[PDB]
Structures are given as C-alpha cells and as structure tokens.
C-alpha cells in the first residue's frame, strides 16, 4: 500500500476512481482534457464504468457570450460514442447546450441528476462575421446549419424524440428541472437525498420542540388561512364569470336567426346531430350546475342589505340611445325593442 502514494490532489483523487468531472465551459482545453481522460479510462479497462459529473454551461457563458464553438461539443460527444465501456452521467447544477447532450448521451438508464439541477437546451449562436461577402455569408450559414443538425442528431440519440420536435423546442431557451428532464428524455433517475438524513432531520425538528414553538405555528396558521381565503376569492371570480355567461344566455335566448341552419349545413354528414370532436373545441356546460349540495352551508353572512331594484321588464319598446345602420334588426316577439 505504500508503493502507490496517496493522490497528490483532488482531481487525481477523483479520476483515480473513474470519475470524469466536467465542470467548466466547454473550451478547447476542457475538451482536450476530457478526451484524454476518457481515452485513458478506456485504456485501463473497457468494461469498468465511468461516472461523469456535469456542472457546465456548454460552449457559451450563461450570459450569452460565445466562448468556444459548436464543434467542441461534437468532439466530446463523438468521443463518448467512441469509448465503449458504460458511462453514467450525473447532472450537477447546470447542464446547458452541449453539456446537456453529454448528459443525455450517457448509458441509458444511468443518466441521473440532483433534485434541483437545471438542464437547459437552446440553439447554437456564432460570433459576428464582420461584414463578409454574400457567398461567405451563405457558406457560414451552411456551416452553422450543419453543426446545428449535428447537435440535433446527437440530441435525438440522447432523448429519443424526433429531430423536428427538438428543432422546434430549441428555437428558444428550454429550461428543464429533473422532473422535466426525466419527462423529456434527458435523464432517467433523480438522486433523491439520503433517507436516513431526512428521517433524522424530521425527528430532530419534532423532538427538540423547535418546529412547534419558535413562532412557527402562528405563521403556518397564517399561511393556511391565506391559502383558503385566496381559493375562496378565486371561486367567487369563477362564479362571477359564470353568472356573466348566464346573463349572456338569458339575453341571447331572444333570437330569430337562420344562421344556425347554415351551421347545420356546413358540418359533416355524421355530425348532422350535435356530436363533438374530442378536441380543444370543447364546450363546457354550466347550465347543468344543479349541484344541490346540502352540505356546503352558507356561512353567517347578511346579503339582506342589498337594495330592492326597480324590477325592470325587458318587454318594452324603449331602446338605448345608440346608432346602427342595419334595418334587418326587426323587433322580436319577446323583444319589441330588439
């Protein structure tokens, strides 16, 4: 055991356990180091696994300042394709751009992430050309297009999703929490915190009497009261909206039109009857709101201070002082004022 001394520092200490730590913006020096370490770890054995930790912001700073190119990521990802022993990639903190592809490019079922880490994917950008000709602008765009397509193909191998969907999603920043990355295809697992730690934490909070009396109960009560009050306020807003729609239907039941016959005509032969189409053309029905709930009792509140209206009838001829050049608006049998 003396013959191999203790490792001189921390990178040697980690890399000695086959942990390739990618934690820096993917610059040419970082890419070269990653390639050298992956090739060396295949050399020491191509069955032993490699645990790659990814806390990196891709080829550009999160500020947006381009700092390498779209081909350092292609090198690293094609390297990970070249090495044949299993790679488990754990996402720590940030995995942006190509550093997200690398996260999704590990061995499937072994890609993981910490519970709060963020995996962003966007579309590559390039530094300003500097007023080149026309053909050189076309050629630069073809370069950028080929590298974007490479990013898309590698991200399709990673996630599992078509190229077109990924292209559409990439056009703007796409931020993914581990639940979202797990949904999308980036990762497979989430590294839950240690259970014994959490259990001991809860027990300490209970037993010490800190969770009960340090001011906690008063403001937890305040929190629940605010939640209930705001839920009730939103329910009242929904009630207001539904009553407005009911008023529109009350004042729209006085109609004489032949356009409904046209709407019967346009629809298909199968839907000659009212037969909806299981789509976002979805008619929610308010009128069958005969809840009849005898349990939800009105609280001790007094609405008897509301006045007594004039009790107007709509079956009059008087009209509001408006302007309309249409003379098809005949008075209705129920609306002589129309």
């Amino acid at each position: 055991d003396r013959r191999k001394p203790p490792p001189p520092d921390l990178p040697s200490l980690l890399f000695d356990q086959r942990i390739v730590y990618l934690g820096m913006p993917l610059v040419p020096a970082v890419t070269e180091l990653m390639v050298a370490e992956l090739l060396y770890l295949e050399k020491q054995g191509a069955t032993l696994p490699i645990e790659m930790l990814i806390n990196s912001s891709g080829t550009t700073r999160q500020d947006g300042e381009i700092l390498s190119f779209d081909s350092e990521g292609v090198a690293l990802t094609s390297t990970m394709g070249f090495i044949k022993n299993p790679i488990s990639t754990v996402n720590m903190g940030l995995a942006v751009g190509w550093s997200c592809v690398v996260l999704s490019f590990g061995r499937k079922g072994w890609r993981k992430s910490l519970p709060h880490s963020l995996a962003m994917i966007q579309q590559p950008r390039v530094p300003p050309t500097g007023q080149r000709q026309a053909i050189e602008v076309h050629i630069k765009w073809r370069e950028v297009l080929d590298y974007k397509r490479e990013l898309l193909r590698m991200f399709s191998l990673g996630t599992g999703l078509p190229v077109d969907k990924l292209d559409a999603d990439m056009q703007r920043p796409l931020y993914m929490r581990p639940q979202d990355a797990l949904e999308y295809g980036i990762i497979d697992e989430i590294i839950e915190p240690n259970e014994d730690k959490a259990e001991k934490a809860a027990q300490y909070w209970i037993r010490s009497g800190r969770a009960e009396s340090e001011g906690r109960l008063e403001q937890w009560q305040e929190y629940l009261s605010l939640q209930e009050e705001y839920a009730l306020k939103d329910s009242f807003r929904k009630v207001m909206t539904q009553d407005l729609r009911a008023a529109y239907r009350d004042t729209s039941s006085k109609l004489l039109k032949n356009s409904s016959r046209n709407m019967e005509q346009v629809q298909e032969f199968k839907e000659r009857l009212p037969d909806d189409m299981l789509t976002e053309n979805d008619e929610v029905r308010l009128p069958f709101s005969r809840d009849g709930v005898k349990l939800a009792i009105l609280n001790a509140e007094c609405y008897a201070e509301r006045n007594i209206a004039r009790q107007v009838a709509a079956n009059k001829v008087s009209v509001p002082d408006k302007w309309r050049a249409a003379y098809a608006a005949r008075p209705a049998p129920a609306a002589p004022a129309a």
Binding site: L161, E183, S235, K238, L278, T279, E280, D282, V284, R285, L286, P287, F288, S289, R290, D291, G292, V293, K294, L295
Partner: protein, 162 residues
C-alpha cells in the same frame, strides 16, 4: 409492480368492451383538453358517457336519473373544482394516482368477482371505493357500500375481499 401501469395492461389484458371503451374514452379526453394526465373524474365521465353500459344503468337504479345531466355536472366540477387547464405537449398521456389505483382495484375486483375479464361494474366499485361517486353526488347518498349491495343484487353473486 408498477409494470401494471403499461399500455399492455390496457390492451393486452383481457378486458370487456365496456371497461376498455371507458378507459380509452378517458384517455381521449385527457388528450383532448390537452392536459395529458387522466383523472378519476374522467373515468367517471367515461362511465356516464356510455349510458348503455350496465355500470351507468346501475347508477340509474341507484338514483341518477339525469345521466346526461350527471355527466355534465361532473364535467362542470372538473372545469371548476379541479382543472381542465391545457398543458404543453406530453408524448405519453399519464395517469393520476387515484386513476391508476382505480385501474388496479378494478382488476383486483374482477379477480375476487370471478370474472376472467375486467368489467365496467368493477370499475364503478373502484370509483366508489375511491370516494369519486360520493365526492360528486353527496345528495344521492351514493357510497361505496350502497353500490356494493347494488351490484351484488345486479349480478346475484356474492363477492368477498381480503
């Protein structure tokens, strides 16, 4: 094992036409409103939609005369109490905790009920054991055990559970 939450266990598993149609309609409704996650109320809407199915006919005998009205009441509750909030685009329609438990319970019922297939009456008992019937029509006093007896009378075969 959570492999029961699989499309095979919906298609490959021997189910009646009624239960399969109910679940497929619930999935169609989860996809339609763009909220790719089936709730237990969407399953109940599947039952109420098929008025011809014996499950919905057992509800008629238990006091739900207005079955179209009951379907619309449930949809209105879903819009208000719950939420038909359209989400983004999930490639695979998911299943809520209550709804997946209702699927497992319906198959477990069928086992103890002798039916080699999974039936709609079993789904209705699964909904009742999850409150869903009493969570929506407390006026009709329609609880898990009342429909337990209703379906016992309907099929005339005693059922027993662990």
């Amino acid at each position: 094992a959570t492999a029961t939450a699989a499309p095979s266990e919906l298609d490959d598993v021997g189910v009646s036409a009624a239960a399969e149609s109910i679940i497929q309609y619930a999935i169609n409704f989860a996809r339609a409103s763009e909220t790719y996650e089936v709730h237990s109320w969407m399953v109940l809407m599947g039952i109420l939609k098929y008025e011809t199915c014996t499950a919905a006919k057992i509800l008629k005998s238990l006091g739900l005369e207005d079955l179209y009205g009951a379907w619309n009441e449930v949809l209105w509750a879903l819009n208000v109490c719950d939420g038909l909030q359209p989400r983004s685009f999930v490639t695979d329609i998911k299943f809520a905790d209550r709804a997946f438990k209702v699927i497992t319970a319906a198959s477990d019922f069928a086992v103890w009920h002798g039916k080699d297939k999974m039936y709609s009456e079993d789904v209705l008992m699964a909904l009742a054991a999850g409150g869903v019937l009493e969570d929506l029509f407390p006026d009709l006093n329609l609880s898990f055990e009342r429909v337990r007896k209703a379906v016992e009378k309907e099929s005339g075969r005693r059922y027993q559970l662990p």
